[PDB]
């Protein structure tokens, strides 16, 4: 029964460690993604600013 | 030593299920950040564009 308790906590912990890499992976992507939408607004609003100028010029 | 052996198989277990979870996430907003890089890449080519007509004006 040692025995199977050692191989059930070096299970666990390997699953614990592949889920800490997940979660830095998801965080890093995610404000990745953030950062692009917004930049995405900006160049929208870039657009129908410059859209605008050739109009008037 | 068996009850501890089973309460860490089933933290295990528990593991397993938010790693598998996690990989759901990632890959899906993987895929969204690469739209929306597709989508920033058109904005860009856009506003190169504007800019050489509004040089010309």
């Given at each position: 029964?040692?025995?199977?308790?050692?191989?059930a906590e070096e299970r666990a912990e390997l699953s614990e460690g592949k889920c800490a890499e997940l979660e830095e992976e998801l965080k890093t992507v995610t404000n990745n993604l953030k950062?692009?939408?917004?930049?995405?607004?900006?160049?929208?609003q870039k657009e129908d600013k410059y859209e605008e100028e050739i109009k008037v010029l």
């Open positions: 029964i040692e025995s199977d308790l050692e191989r950062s692009l939408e917004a930049q995405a607004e900006k160049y929208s």
